[PDB]
Structures are given as C-alpha cells and as structure tokens.
C-alpha cells in the first residue's frame, strides 16, 4: 500500500521523531534534568554527548528539546542556536550565524565591535539561550579556539544562562582541547555506547518495522503487525540478523537493510517475506574489489598473475612495468602456447588501465620526473582475492589458470 | 683530469671586530688592480643602454667595485641596490621595494606574479622611468631558486630597466639554461680583484667557530 | 531516440528506490562500475523519461568549490523558472533552502547527480560529508547520486560519514556487447550482415578490449573495408568465409596502428578510401630522432653511461641493470666521464653547464632530490637504449662496448 | 530547599568578595601598585601559574580595593584599562582597543600603535599574553617597554600560564602555586559555612582527589555540584557514596567500556592486532598483516570468512572513534595500524 | 647607505632640479681623438644594425611559408566538420627544433598568418604562467577578450556573444614545461563542450613527438586528432642568414676568419641558435666601431668618398700608419712615397681610389665564390665542403690553390660526363645572370659560348682550366689588400671571453698561480695570499690543516692572529664551491678533485 511506504520511508530515510527510546533511559534522564534546570533556573551548563556513528545523539537531543518545549513557560522564553562543524568552518561564519539565528541581524546593524566577545556580549544583552554544537570535534581544530573559550567563559562567569551541548564521535575529545578551555568545561559526559544484546536487537527489528496506532485502516495494520510478529521468529531471518549484528550494532545499517527489504513490496506482493530480507542482505554484503576484477579483460588478468608471481618470488619489493612484462613474456614464449604474444604498447595500455582503476599504487608519486616504464609500483590486491575472483571469471582460459596455480 | 678523479675517488665573532690588525702584503700590487677596472665603467654604461646586462666573476669580493660604480656614474637615476648575502632577503622583498618606493603605490598584492605583471605593465605604459638594479650576489641560497630568477629575468628583459650582477660560486653557470639566458643578455667580464669577503662572510662566521 | 539494452535489473532497482514523488528516498546512492557500463547514460535517460527535477553536474569541470555550488544553484533556478553567488557551503545550504520552496519544487524529490565523483575528495575535507548528509542539513527531500569508477573504501574520510547505499553496475559480457553494437544499423545493408561483422570484430578484439566506446569506434572505421567485396562483386552477402578472409588480416593490422593511435582515424579512412596499403606510414611513433649539438650528444652519452653502470667498474672501463631503472649520479662523475670519452681538450665554459641544465628542461635528464641547486649534483638519465645507440652511431662511438661485458 | 542554595553557592559564577587562602598575594600586588601610584611612577609585573590558581579573581579584588581607596581620596584617581588576548580576533587589535579605551578616537592598527607610542596614570591589565605573540614579536616587547619611561606613567600587569615566558622575548616576577589539600578544603567549607548540606567526609574525598590530580578550584566546584545532583536523585545529606560516584563519573576514561561494548568482529580485529604485535614486536603493522591474522582467527572462532570490504569498514569504524590510529583510507591494504591505547588495557577489556 | 638591517636600498635624486637627462653616446666618448668623428661612428653603427635586423626578419618570414600553407590547409579542412555540423579535438604537433631561442620569432610569423587567413581569434600560452587550472583559464580568457571567477561556461558565453563561426586557436608553445594535470584537465573539460566552442590546438614540441606519450596517457590522447608537422632546419636558416648578411655587398661590414670560426664553433658545438649568432655580430660591430677611429669610412661607397673628402688633420696621419698602407707605399716607386706622405690631398684622392678597388674586389670575389659552389656541389664526395659557409671559411683562411686539397677536387672534376657538365654550366650562367652590374663581362660570354657548343675531353679540360683560372684571379684573401682594416673586424679573443666565458679556469688559475695576476715575483715554480696557500695545502681534518697552515705562515713570515687568518681563509673557501662539512670526521670533503 502507498501509506505503508510513506510512513516507513519517513521512518528510515529522513530520520524522524518516534516515541521509542532504546537503552538510553538513564542518559535521557540526565540530559532532560540538566536542560530543564537551565531553562527554568539560571544555571549555565556544558555537556559532551559522545557516541559512535548512528548511535542516536541527534535523536536524543531532539527528543529532549521537544519534551522541554512542551512546557509552556519554556516555550515562550527560551531561544536555541544550532551550529554544525561542517557548515561553519571559521569563527567569522559561526559568529554571523549566531547573529542571524537570534534574529538580531537588524539589531546589530553597522555597529563595529573591538573584540569577538564584545560582539557576543552585545548579542546576549538583547531570556536563556541553548547552544547545540553538532560536529564538536571540528570546532576544536580552529586557530586558537576562540569560539570554545568564549562560550565556556560566558557559561562559567556571566550571569546570562547558557547551555552548551556538544555532540562528538571522538573518544579522545578531552585531548584536543587547550588547557584553559579544558579548565572551563565542566566534565559532564553522556556516553551513548551500544549496550544491548542480540534478543534486544530482534525486538529492535520487530519494533521498527511496525505500523503505528494512528493508522486509518485498522485491519490491514493488524494483519501487517501479525505478519511482522511471525517474521521475527523465523530462523532464516535471524541468521542474516545475526550476521549484520556481528558486523556492527549500529541501527542505521539495520535501517538500510529494512529499506532494501521493503523496496520489494508492491501491490502484487503486499507482505514482507524472508526471501526479501535475504536478497537485501546479499545486496549489502558484496565485495567491491571482486566486482572490479570481474570486469577486466584477459590481458589485464595475465598482468595481475605476473604481478602476483613477482610479489611471491621477490617478497615485499615494488616493481616497474619491465619486470612484469618480462614475466609475462616468460609465460607467452614457453609455458602455454603461441598466442597472447601481444606487442609492448598494447600491454602498456592495459597496465595504464590497471593504474587508472587504482588497483596499482605508485611507490613514490613524482609526475614528470620519470618515464612510464622504470617507475616502481605496488599491487593493491591480496592473493586470495585474486584466486577467488579468478575462479569466478566468466570464460577464463585453462592455461592462464594453470599458470596461476603453478 | 679524470685520471686524478678516479684515483682519489677510489673563538667568538666579537673577537673579530677587535682582531683586525692584519696587514695586506701586496698593498702596492693590489692597488693597481682597482683603477685598472675603473676604465671599463664607460663601456658598461654604454652597453647597458643598448640592452645588454653585465655579470662579474672573479676570486675576491666584487662588492667594492660595484660600490665604486655607484659613486662614479649613477648619481642621477632611480637606482636600487640589492644584497644577495643578506639572510632575510627575498624576491618578494625586491618586488615590494620597486612597487612601494619608486612608483609610490601603497597597497597589497594577491601574489608575486600579479605584482610582477603590474610592474611590467606600468613600465610598458611609460618610458619616462629609468631604473637600475645592482645585485651584489645573485647566486646566494635565497636567490638560487629558479622561480626567483625567472621573476628577475622577466624584470631585466625590458628596455627601460638595467641590471649589473656578481657571481661567486663555482657552479653558477648551472643555474641558467638556454631559455633563461635569452632573457638576460649577459656580457661576462672577469673582475678578479683580491679583496676579502667581510660583509658577506660576517653571516658565515655566525654558524661556525 | 534512447533505448537501454541489457540494463533491466539496474533500472528496476533505481525506479523502485525513487518511489513516488512525495515519498522520501535514500539520502545518497553511490553508483560504481567500469569505464563504459551505462553509468551516465542509464541514469540520464531514466531521469529524463520520468520527468523528475534533476541537476547533472560534472566535477572535473568545476575545479573549485564556488564553481560547483554556483552551478548547482543556477541550474536549480533555471528548473524552477538571475545570478546567485555563494562562496561557502553554509550559504549554499541557506540558498538551497531558499530556492527549493517554490511551488514547483515544494513536494517532490530533487536530484543532484555528480559525475566523476573521484575528484570531490581532492577538493576539501568538509565537502563530501556535507553532500552525504544534505537531506539532514537542508531538510528538503533531496537525493544525491555519486557516479564513480573507484570503489567506496577509497572514499571514506578518517572521521567517518553518513553511509550511502552502494550500487554496482555490472560489466557487459560478449553477448551483451554483441546485442548493443548490432542495434544502430547501417540501413543500406541487412541486419545479419552487420551482425556477422560485429561477430568477427569481437572475435578479434575482445581479448584486449572490453570497452564499448572503443569497439564502436573501431566498428565504424573498419566497415567500408568489409563491404567493398560486395561492391566490387567478388563476394555476396551469404559468402561469410570470403568476407572474414578479407577482413581478418586488416583487423590484425588495425590493432597495432589505430587502437594505439599512431595513425589517426582520418588518416586510416583516407588510406582505405585511396586504397593505399595500411601501415605504410611511420605514424606518431617511430619518429625517435632529435637533432642535437655536438657537446649535447656527448653530455647525453656520458649521462647514460653514468646512470646505468656501477661506480666500481668505472676505473676499469674508462681510465684504461637495464631492469630496475636508472641509478642517480653526481655531477662530478658526469664531468669525469665527459672528459674521458672526448678525445680532445674540453674547457668547462659557461655554455657546457648551460647545456647540462638545458637538457633537464627538455626532459632528456631529470634532477632528483632538489636538495640544493648550485651544490646539488644529483641527476638521472631518462631516455632509452635505442635513442642513445643511434646518437652514438651518429658521433661514431661504441656504447655497447662500455655499458657491460 | 537546602541543596538548591548549595547549588547557588557552589556555582563558579558566584565569586566571593573576599577570597580565602589568597591573602598574601593580594597584599603583595596591592603594595606593588601602591608603590607606583602614590609617587606617580611607572612599572611592569608578570604573573604566572596553572589555570586553577585564582589569578584573575585576586587581580580584580586588588583593583576593586584600589578603586575604593581612590574613591576615599587616599590615592590619586586612576583610569583602568583591561585587555584579554583570547577575546581578540587578531593580535594587533590590542592597539585599536587600548586607544579606544584611552581616548575616543578609532583608527587602524598601525595608526593606533603610533598614537599609543606618542601618548607614552592608567593601570593596564593584559590577561592571556600568549596569543599576542607574532613572528616579528613587536607586541610583547612594546607591552613591556612602554611603562619604563618617564612620560608613560603606566602600570602593566601580565597574566599567563608559563612562568618561563619572558626570557625568549629577551619586570617583577610573580608565581601562583596550585592549591593543596587544606586550601581546597577551606574554599569548599567557606562556600557552605551556614548550610548543613554536605558531610565532611565527602569534602575530604573531593578535596583529596582534586588536589592529587591537578589542583584546580573549578574542578572542586563542578564535582561538588554533580554530587549534589546525584544525592538529589537518591531521595538529605551528600554522603561519601555520591561523591565517590561523581569523582569516577568525571575522572574515569571510557576506552575500556568502549572496547567491551563493541561488536564481535571489532573485538576479533583487536585480537588480530595484538597477535600481530606478539608475532612481530613492533608498534605498527600494515593492514595486510592484521587481515592475514584475522582470517585465521575468524576461522578458528567459527565465524564466516571475512571480505576486505567488511574488514575495512571495521577498521574505519575503530579508527574513527580513536581507539586506533590509522592513515587515510585512500591508500588501502598498506595502512599501518597502531594502537592508541595500551595493550594491557585491551587485554583487561577483552578478557571478560 | 648600503648596509643596515634591510636588504634593499632605493635611492632617488629627489628634492633637486636635475630633471634633465644625460643623452646617450656621451659614454661612447671615453677616448678623446676627435669630438665629431665619434658621433658619426655611432650613427653609422645604429644605421647598419637596423638594416641587419630588418633583413633578418624578412629572411625568416620568407623561409617558413610552406609549413604555414600546409597548416592553414589543415585548419580549414578540420573546421569544415564544424561548418557541416562527440568528435576529437583537431591538434597539430608542430615539431620545432632544439633551438629554443628562435621559437618565439617563429610563433610571431605563425600568428599573423592565421590572423590573415583562418581565424581572428588566436591566443598563445606559455607554461611559466600556468601552474594550475585557474591560472591557465584566467590567462586564456583575458587574451580572448582583448583581441569574477570565470569557468568554461564563460568561454562559451563569450563565443556566443561575439559570433551570433570562426574557430579559436590556442598555441601552447612548450610541451616539456607544462604540468601533466592541467593538460589532462583542459582536454577533458574542453572535449565535452566542442559543439558550442570550436577548439583547435597547436602543440609546440622541441624534441621528438613521443613526448606526447610521456605526458598524456592513452585515455586522454584518444580525445585528440593529431596530425604531425615539421619546421625548418637550423642549418638551412643559418646558411641563408650568412648568405644574406655576410656574403652580400649591400652590407659594408665584414668579419675576419677567426671571428667566424668562433661563432661557428659556438653554433655547431654548443647550441644551434641564430639569435646568438646575431648577438655575436652585434657585439663585433659595436667593438669595431669603438676601437677603430677610421672605421667611419665603413659605409656605402659614395658616402665613404664624401667622408674621405672631409677629415681632420690627425685622421690622415692615422691613415698613414696602417700596415696595409705601409706595405702599399713600400712596394711603389720612390717619388710616390714622399707624394703620399707629405701631401694630404693626394692622400685623400688615392684612398678614394683604393676603397673602390676594394669594393670591386669584394663583388668579384663573391660572384666567383658562388660560381665555384656550383662545381663543388655538383661533384660528389664534397672535400672542401657541402655548404657555402665551409667553402667561404676554407677560402678565407688561405688561398685554396696553395692547399693540396684543391688539386684532388680538380682531379675529381675532370671525371664527369656530359649531362652533369651541362647542368653545371646552366647553373653557373644562371648565377652570372642573377647578380646584375657584372664587372666580369667576359666570363659570362665565355660560359655562354661553352653552353652554345653543345672530342669531348678537350672541351672538358678547357672548361676545367676556365674555372681554375677564374679562381686564380678572383679568389684572394682580404689580408693581401689595401685598407681592408676599415671594413674588417679581428678581435677574436675578447669576443670569445665576452660571449663564452670559463669561470672555473679563472678561479683555478688565480688560486694556483697568483704571480700571473700579481707580477711581483709571487711565484716561479710560501709567499702567497692566504686563500692561495690554503688551496694548495688541501690540494682534510681541520686541526691538522690549521697546524700545517700555521707552519707555512710562520716559515714565510703570542699573537693569535694567524688562526683567525685560517678561519677567514676557510670560510672564504667555503663560500665558494670547495668545502662542505661532513659528520664522519671533523671535516672530510674534496669537491673539486681535478
Ligand atoms: N537508542 C535508540 N533509540 C531510538 N532510536 C535510535 C537509537 N539508536 C539509534 N536510533 C536511530 O538510528 C539513527 C541514529 O542516528 P542519529 O542521526 O540519531 O545520530 P547519529 O547518526 O549518531 O549522529 P551523527 O549524524 O553525528 O553520526 C536514528 O534514525 C535513530 O532514530
Ligand atoms: N545499455 C546501453 N544501451 C545503449 N547504449 C549504451 C548502453 N551503455 C552504454 N551505451 C553507449 O555507450 C556510451 C558510453 O557509455 P557511458 O557514457 O554511459 O559510460 P560511462 O560509464 O558514463 O563512462 P565513464 O566511466 O567514462 O564516465 C554512451 O554514449 C552510450 O550511448
Ligand atoms: K635591459
Ligand atoms: Mg547526528
Ligand atoms: Mg560518465
Ligand atoms: Mg584568567
């Protein structure tokens, strides 16, 4: 149905507010209490929310801010400023964004301020403000950390209530900061590590792929949820769920798998099947270098086998085109048969195509200093990738494979 | 001598200001090799105006001879004197010296190449300007760079600017090829005085005993 | 006009992922494949057919950030309907939210296809993660496509990013190539005649070439030679063996010449039009002869003996491998060799040193290291054995006697 | 209530009017300023220390008491100028500021520098000296040598974090030492003198841990307010248990709990790195060696055979969160990997 | 004034009213002989130099015409496709020589011809000001506009604005110097926009064309349509510029055999360059008009006789002391000696006769040289030389019949058949017809009589004796002629050291033999300056070296001055290219070893 696709595409792709909170109750208690304390009293605080990728940092701060804004007195008189470490790469850009988001762009006018903190103090004196700093580890790679010092200093000293929430992925975030800004940062840390096991992951699979209680057609929602409940207990589902849980505990990978699974649901196929999830798992788990080696010609495969022989005889030493061509000539003149005795320029063309795909990397990159041959290079394919991709080559000649084993 | 080659290959500096009681031995003999080279000044002044440039090679310090040259002839020109032996010298610095002092411009340029194009176009617009570039060392470690001499050669090729230079190093003909020795119309003049290096080697005495 | 052949699973997956207009698709798909596998063609025809608002941008042409962002903004403003200038990615996000809110573009998915996406990673660190997360930052229902030839593992930044859905466009096999090449028919002959021509062409060239573009260009070039027996009358359309006997030595000579671009395509067409024998010319290569002065010739011979010969054998050869590349030498060794091979007095004038540094600018030598300029003696001899042996034959000198025993 | 006023007194923004445990330093700085304000002469002073010592508070207290002295007609009236180095956008922006602080005129940097040179009763204070450094280094040397003239009649105070600063520049020197056990205890009991909100064993623990680790006052105030929050959850009196929870909530490193909570293949990758370091004996190893050990480890564990496009994702995930230190992934299979953490911490985290 | 803590000292003559400038040629009067004569000499120098420069540029624009015709044919044929209608970019690989300094002039000749025939939109780019793609494209667009962050779309917008049909042509002068990346990026960007921006590329190549394979891979060289072209040889342009600047009577200035040997050795051995040969002739002309006072007569012959009419009294005595004039009065009779020495008017008239005799000698000598060239060119095996310049040198150093090499040429010349001799006589009679105002009126009639006559051996030996007697009479060295010093230049050594110097020989001679520059008995086979004795001491641990230097300086001559002399004489030797410190010892280095 169309509405199922709409609601589930808004759930998985454009990551959307859903009521469920998974293993973050203590952390949400800490964050909600601190934000409510900043909003209703005059306390000024700093938090670093630390977690790996896709572990629910922005979900937690958006949910906490939504519940905080449900209070009417907070919603009347609390201002927010969002700043990302990707968009604002300088302190001038960030300061312009602070002036614009506080709706004081008309107020500041043509007035000139002697220092950055004079600009910020003029901003704040025209009612609490909450600062959210997405990609906090990029704000600490600036010149002298003017923004971090001037935010932590106003939080520690000035009367104006300010909360500085910073979302980061680095576990060493308290080693990039300067000593003086480390002093003014109250070391309140919220860690969203993924502390849940595999049966809880199966409940995650059930709870995300389920229609809400405000859905209009109730009988289709009921039979959809019963089909999902049945699909959670299927052993073929739990094998690929075990494989994806073994790779990572991230929920964003699960959402990618669920979107690839749900993509195969049409008017002809109303309900999800285990084969949909297995096909999605086969899509996600492809090996890229084997896919690239599958598309090569025969001559490039012979070049790669000659390179493998060079790396096996003269171990961990780079090579140029002349040694590779000498080994390939030792093939074509004696070992197998007369043809594939191609000339040097077409073999050089194949070698340059292997360089273009970045299956070969130069040992030293100096363009123009050296000619095309006599340039030392290294192979970026392991032996077992070569053997596995060679077994799956579409029409491989027998003598090339027999040369590769020997 | 490939024969000898193959075979062979197979005290503070503050004292030196006070300890300068050395007496040259051949004072009379070396006094005749300075006014010998004062004869060639008018030939140099003529050949500068016909589009040539002069490079001086020798054993001793040519700095006194160029300093004598400034006092003799160039007393009515907008001339600029460059010290290659100075530790903090750059081709960016000589370009600021020409732009800011001679032409009275007061601004900051985005790159050295844009400023070089601006000085070239300003000299091509007006031929009333005559400017002399004396460079005491052209082979020093700050000016050995190929891009700096590319800028200096593009400066020297115009018809209303002139250049005299001195080289000291043994392998100085390495640092110009056929494309760059077409920008400089060099006339090589041996001025082999025996004066010893005081100003140039005062910085050399810093990093040794 | 445009028809896609042997691309049916890929079109199915793309059209399924796009969904309806008001639906939300993936934030980022990364499409990878080989040098001609319908990356641009299938995507561009599929976005043109479904009438989806999309902007197709090449990253080689936009070599700065400002050019790329202004190209996207101007093309979107042309789709919606003077000049919008943005210097930073921040203003790009703000102006992109400004332009998308028009009545045509409020409730549909806008597509930003970026071709040759392996040039984005060289631009700046914050550009590629910003485009991977553009649906989250702008909140404007946006999908961004990345067409590339390099795999995704070479693209990941050190700090991580939002992961795209990675899709693979498979290679064309010999059956797919034969089906695609036999579609743009020459109308003056039959279908199976051109099919047999494509069959013998792929019989010759499939070992060394799997590229559809090069094979189609070769099929365009060699076709009048194939169909001149039926013009003259020696053969007919059903005489396949006569046609293949005519065409296969010509096809085995075209590989050495036109595929390597020694003889140009227009020259090849003129040779078969004028009936002149193929491979009767030198081409671009085999013109390896440069006219040098006398001392430049001995400087180059001295450098070639300095580079490819060890220093321990110097005194045995001159006073009284070819693999592994050149070996660097100092300037003093070069001058010692030069004074030892010339049987006359040579003065070390300024022009000989100017010759040594001018052979570097002609790429016949290369200085290595660049530690110092005047007191930097390091040089290499970057030229081959045949060029040096021809020069040594010109000055009447025996280079093989002095290279090795 | 009771803990609410504890949160009000314990806040860093509530600086006391009279500071405990820094009465000698106030007396020394006040006598150094009184020896130069009454006789109408000029001088320079440099102050240093680690950031928790209390320099800015004592300097502002000295300036406050001198302002009340001048208001009471004891000393001649004096203008106060304050410049902070970190708050400025550019290093030269001192010159446009001090002039604007001294006279009404606004100008460029160099022209304000010239008018400040020609101008030289004002008492300048320059906090955060380290950011006024330039490669030409005129700002530092000027800021010392203007007050040592007869026309200038200026007093310069300078604050920084390194005591060995004004020797590389080529001046009374003052050093603030970090607080000990008893001084930190005195500050914490001074803030809570009339309030029965804390047990003295908790104050004992917080003072002894902070005085052991760094020696800052802001850390004491933060740990005490966080322990107040933890005690507010368990509902009083802030016992030894709540401060013990706060001190290792704010002091412990979360590397071991990150390694323990990772997925199966990430722990197997770490075991492969350790096995490669045992076989080699170095501190770096290429991705090829680690993957060659990891295939064997996944074989004996019973896990399915790992692809390189999966092991590269595991390596990028571990290196992204700074458990490992890796090169950019643009070169691949030649990535030398080194552990960010010690091997003993890894074996402590993986054994359970 | 010349030393503070700054590396630049600008000086201005401001605040004083000396706005007037000093005119040129005041520096030419460094030796006072006559105040008026030197000005006339400088004007004669400027006039002759302008004539030689204009003749050189006319010669060079004449020679490159055929290659320009083929290239214009290629450009029109390649743009016929865009006139009809992805295609390849049409490129021409113009293989210039190794003679780099010539190329700029060639490109000037290449530009205006295209601007007259194919396109009005021609631009030239060099690699020195294109480090990256932004500078390459910014430099390209402005040269397009005169004939904001611009891109490739601005080029298409400008083209659509100005045309509303001709191509644009971009000449990249030097393939060796461009970066690989800007070439690859420019080709890839420009190829996909060929439908609305027609681009034709000429690649100026100095070496063989395989450098295209060196910079560009096969994936990018397949986007080009390369057709190869070749330019004129250096040798042919050299022989043409000597035949139209030295072997003509139109220019009065000539050079001696040794100066010509100097210039041909620095041409053939060091570098092919005709601009260096032109610079050598400019310096020869300059120093000849400097050193010689009576070189004012080296101009066109009526002006020369007009100058002979009006001279100063000292100039006549300067004429009298010429060595050729001295030998000329020695060989005459007794009364003519005092007639020439005493009276200066008879001197003026007699020198007026002698200049005209020299002028007709030059004309006869060049036409007989041109006639002998046909005989030696038709004859195989070329003993005297295959080129006119080799023949001119070997006849200029000495008469060719005194040498025994000419007898073998004559002996080979007797063994020819009829068709070759008919070809020789036709070419030589064409030579006589080509140069008008002949003073050899008899020989043209003689050779037309020999051509008219068609016992073959007797007429064959008759024509052999004819050309033999011709080169007896008129091939003659200029050193055996009166007043040749007026119009000849012989300063080989000074010209050689000004053009082609040797600094390492000078440094070695100064250090090893300081008596050569200080003739005060400083050396015959301890008494030396400090640098010259330290250099001979090392040709190297420092302490033993200092003891050896101290032993020598105390043998030759509580002070502690001599150790500072050692420090200065090692630091000075280190400022030159001799001493480099090394960590194996306190010092162990020998950078010369020669
Ligand atoms: N514990 C959880 N409870 C509910 N949803 C979760 C949880 N963990 C992850 N998610 C879901 O997974 C995704 C997590 O990514 P999110 O954007 O919230 O933060 P993030 O991706 O870690 O931040 P960043 O973009 O900086 O990496 C969201 O869609 C969220 O809905
Ligand atoms: N399935 C197909 N059906 C018809 N024509 C095709 C097909 N695939 C490719 N072509 C033709 O081959 C040409 C090259 O394909 P395309 O440009 O899509 O390759 P590409 O992968 O974009 O190349 P690159 O990797 O260089 O960007 C196209 O012009 C197209 O006309
Ligand atoms: K000049
Ligand atoms: Mg997030
Ligand atoms: Mg494409
Ligand atoms: Mg402070």
Numbering used by the authors:
A (entry chain D): 17 to 142, 152 to 431
B (entry chain B): 239 to 248, 268 to 466
C (entry chain E): 5 to 85, 92 to 330, 349 to 433
D (entry chain A): 486 to 605, 614 to 663, 673 to 737, 744 to 860
E (entry chain C): 3 to 87, 97 to 158, 177 to 193, 212 to 501, 547 to 617, 624 to 637, 643 to 660, 672 to 708
Sentences from the paper on this structure:
The very first step of this initiation process is accomplished by DNA association with the Origin Recognition Complex (ORC), a six-subunit protein that forms a partial ring around origin DNA. The complex consists of six subunits (ORC1-6), with subunits ORC1-5 forming a partial ring capable of encircling DNA. All five subunits contain a winged-helix domain (WHD) and a AAA+ domain which consists of the RecA-fold and lid domains, although the ORC2 and ORC3 RecA-folds have diverged slightly and do not contain a lid domain. Adjacent ORC subunits associate in a double-layer arrangement through interfaces between the WHDs in one layer and the AAA+ domains in another with ATP-binding sites sandwiched between the ORC1·4, ORC4·5, and ORC5·3 AAA+ interfaces.
The ORC1 AAA+ domain in this structure is ordered and forms the important interface with ORC4 with an ATP coordinated between the two subunits, an ATPase active conformation seen in previous ScORC and HsORC structures. In the ORCO1AAA structure, the ORC2 WHD undergoes conformational changes but does not change its overall position in the complex. ORCO1AAA was especially improved in this region due to the 3D focused refinement we applied. The homologous ORC4 region in HsORC is visible in the ORCO1AAA cryoEM density map allowing us to now model this region. This region in HsORC is 20 residues shorter than the ScORC segment and does not contain an α-helix.
